[PDB]
Amino acid sequence: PIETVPVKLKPGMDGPKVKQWPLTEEKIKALVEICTEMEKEGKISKIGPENPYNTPVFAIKKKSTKWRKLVDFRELNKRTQDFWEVQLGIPHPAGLKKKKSVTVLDVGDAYFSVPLDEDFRKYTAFTIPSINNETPGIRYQYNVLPQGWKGSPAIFQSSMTKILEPFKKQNPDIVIYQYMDDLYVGSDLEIGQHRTKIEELRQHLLRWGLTTPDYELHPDKWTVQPIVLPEKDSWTVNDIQKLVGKLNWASQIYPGIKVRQLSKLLRGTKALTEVIPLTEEAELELAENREILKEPVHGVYYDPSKDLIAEIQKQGQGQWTYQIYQEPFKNLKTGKYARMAHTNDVKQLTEAVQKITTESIVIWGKTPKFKLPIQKETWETWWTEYWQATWIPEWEFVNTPPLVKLWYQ
Amino acid sequence: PISPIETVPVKLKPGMDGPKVKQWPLTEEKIKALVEICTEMEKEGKISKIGPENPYNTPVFAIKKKWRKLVDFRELNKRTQDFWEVQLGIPHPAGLKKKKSVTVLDVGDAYFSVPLDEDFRKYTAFTIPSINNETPGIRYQYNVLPQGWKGSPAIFQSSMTKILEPFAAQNPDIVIYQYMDDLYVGSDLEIGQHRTKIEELRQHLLRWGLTTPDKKHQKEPPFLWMGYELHPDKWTVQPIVLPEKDSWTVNDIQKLVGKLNWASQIYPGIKVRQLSKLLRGTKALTEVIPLTEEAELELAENREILKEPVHGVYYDPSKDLIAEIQKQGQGQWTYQIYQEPFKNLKTGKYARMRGAHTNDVKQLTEAVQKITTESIVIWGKTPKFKLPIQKETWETWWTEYWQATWIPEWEFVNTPPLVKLWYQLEKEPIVGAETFYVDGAANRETKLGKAGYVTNKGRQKVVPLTNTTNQKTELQAIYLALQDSGLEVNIVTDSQYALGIIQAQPDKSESELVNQIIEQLIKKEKVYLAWVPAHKGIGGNEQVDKLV
Ligand SMILES: CCC(=O)n1c(=O)n(CCOc2cc(Cl)ccc2Oc2cc(Cl)cc(C#N)c2)c2ccccc21
Ligand SMILES: [Mg+2]
Ligand SMILES: [Mg+2]
């Protein structure tokens, strides 16, 4: 709380200038309440028009009648990557996925002590908007490490790693990863004592001055979920077709596949609804390719130079299925998601995205860029309503339908 | 005049420096008229003579139509830092809050009334010529926000904002909206105290240097503001004059589509689909364009709508917000926003198809989006929606649609026309219905093709096609199997294109072919459509891919 680490943008990069989304009068009001207080506690200050930069700003409800502010530093983050990835990069423990339990702790109130480089604050500017453009927004910049910027944890990393040194000494079977404003704590304890070892930590942290929120992921379940060829009692031509098609598509992922014997087992222009039966030479390709679906793929290795790409697909019945990858047909991870007259499609998507993003952080220490199946403007309107996370992935909007659907179910 | 307001610091863009554009000599009459203004601007402190030490210079010219002074800051604007963008958007009258009375105050010399940073005054240096004569010019600098400088609108607005903060605290029963050089004061006081408050404010302003007009010179309703007539209990667009012409150029159709769009906020029913299609070519502005038949009609119907005048009403927070959507037929929708059943807040249209194939359920959904975004911008909330669609029509569609959507709280309305799913493909195949195995192919280079089928009942056909494409035939193939089929039919296709197009269940399309497939699909009472890999000898497509 005295020395301000210097921050440089990557040379020939000006700061962010991103349009503020318009907000419901409800949500504005909260941000005024919240900022008026932040400004008294000195964490932010009003700014003049000699500051052109701006970063968007939302209001979410955390877990909680209490409104919280969420700032979208995606742009600034891109333009500071030199600083929070190379200069003071926090390295990623590639084992947290192994542990049988992982708890996530919000530590981002840590940062509001640390003052922010005097010269860098201009780039944190945000705007509280007004309605109908009655008057120009209220303009602040940050005086302290702001939650949501990737520099913030990168700076604090020393103070964090010191404070953590006692606890890592006492119990060195535990792993602790810091992604932005979250500590991911994994352990192989049975659940009962994991949850107390998490209380320990909590109160360890809390008595060195780090308050924390007063959510257990078992990566012992994560695995590429394989393609399922529904065997039934009956069979038809149609089903032989649906069957043939699935398998032909799969040939791009598992070249080791064949169906000629399938494709000859209906060689006659027949009605679709013909209950055709099972053959020997044909049946030889069902089981023979049915277990190849149990065998994993070959040569699928996470390139850390490349972005992760997540695709989700609505599957009906509150079901959603996702695949993460970097090169087509080379799927690193794949999963499914489901809700429990309480849920709506968006809420579901928003939850799914959150879930896929955490998995992502645990595994690779980087978030994926989402191909969201929704209409840009609908998302840009309702995503903050079920958003609980302190961070925000990149996303885009697939307006091209899938057709595959079940193919990935 | 120059004020005791605090200055904003200003910098030039990094690794740049001040302009040095020399000045073309002007008429000895002009050079006269420049000095008359300069010194009377100097007396008033706005500018200060300087020694040639200052190396900077910016062109000056002069003009009239009382002579006037213009400066070419363009060169300076290029090297000055960027500032916080000013209000790009303007408040929509429909969302202005209803107030007992409304005062409009324009400030004068607004920019000249505000001081400019001292260390950034040098770069504003100009010079007045001495009718050549090898006579040294008059070197002057600004000490206030220069006109047409990049920094002026933003710094002025800061300054105005801050100058108001005290008053606004001591009088929060009143509301001041800010716009460029104006101030729009609205109150719910009695006419005698408001006039008092106004005249009070005017004095606060004057003590900070900002001049403002008398009760005698205050603009009086109705107010011609940003292409709107603002009345004290009603707003509308200004008068609109669509021209009648014999020939229509691109520039003309644009200005027309503009005006028509402008009108759409308060004049219901306005359509612009067919008119805007003309512009599709997006070619030269002076190119003449023939009017289509449908376009001529649309302009006619529009003309009738603007034949009489209609007005919008202001916003009341203590009243609910409502939105109603009415279909119009050509992928054209229209809506009205109201709190009370005959007094509309505003109106508009949604017509974007967003693709060459759509269905009304989708489109209506997209329409609600548009309305929600605007509602939120204008009134900071979203409206209760009154929609011509059955809760059962919608749930069916979205449950079965591949994208995700959010249908805000909404109640039915019966006002026909109503939104419907005209057909629905079967989810499972049909036992005891003929199975057609359609395929169709075309040679790119020959630009000729053929669609056909084959059935389980041994029925076969091939129609020949000229001037088409693979895609065009893939659909004709289906079009055929519908034509030659009973009221229940199984079609089996190798083209994901054609499948894609149909699975979407469009009810309206740019392609006539698809509109006709839509026709046939409506008659049939059961259609099942099924995909199989082409050139994979699935059994039956093989036979139909062979007759091609
Ligand atoms: C019973 C109603 C009544 O007397 N008037 C009324 O309600 N309006 C609409 C509300 O307008 C304003 C509200 C506020 Cl808080 C502030 C200013 C307003 O006016 C503006 C706004 C704008 Cl952006 C530009 C201009 C110009 N030029 C004026 C009226 C508008 C005019 C006259 C009377 C009323
Ligand atoms: Mg004006
Ligand atoms: Mg349509």
Curated annotation (Swiss-Prot), chain A:
Mg(2+) 1 binds at D106, D181, D182. It comes from Human immunodeficiency virus type 1 group M subtype B (isolate BH10). Changing W379L: No effect on RT p66/p51 heterodimerization. Changing Y215A: Complete loss of RNA-dependent DNA polymerase activity. Complete loss of RNA 5'-end and 3'-end cleavages. This is p51 RT. Changing L183I: 29% loss of DNA-directed DNA polymerase activity. 46% loss of RNA-directed DNA polymerase activity. Changing G245A: Complete loss of polymerase activity. 25% loss of RNase H activity. Changing E216A: Complete loss of RNA-dependent DNA polymerase activity. Complete loss of RNA 5'-end and 3'-end cleavages. The chain holds residues 603 to 1027 of 1447 of the full protein.
Swiss-Prot record, chain B:
Changing E525Q: In strain: Isolate PV22. Changing Y179A: Almost complete loss of polymerase activity. Changing S152G: Complete loss of polymerase activity. No loss of RNase H activity. Changing I163D: 16% loss of DNA-directed DNA polymerase activity. 24% loss of RNA-directed DNA polymerase activity. The record marks F436, Y437 as: Cleavage. Changing Y497F: Almost no effect on RNAase H activity and replication. Residues 430-548 form the RNase H type-1 domain. This is Reverse transcriptase/ribonuclease H. It comes from Human immunodeficiency virus type 1 group M subtype B (isolate BH10) (HIV-1). The lineage of its organism: Viruses, Riboviria, Pararnavirae, Artverviricota, Revtraviricetes. The gene is gag-pol. The chain holds residues 600 to 1151 of 1447 of the full protein.
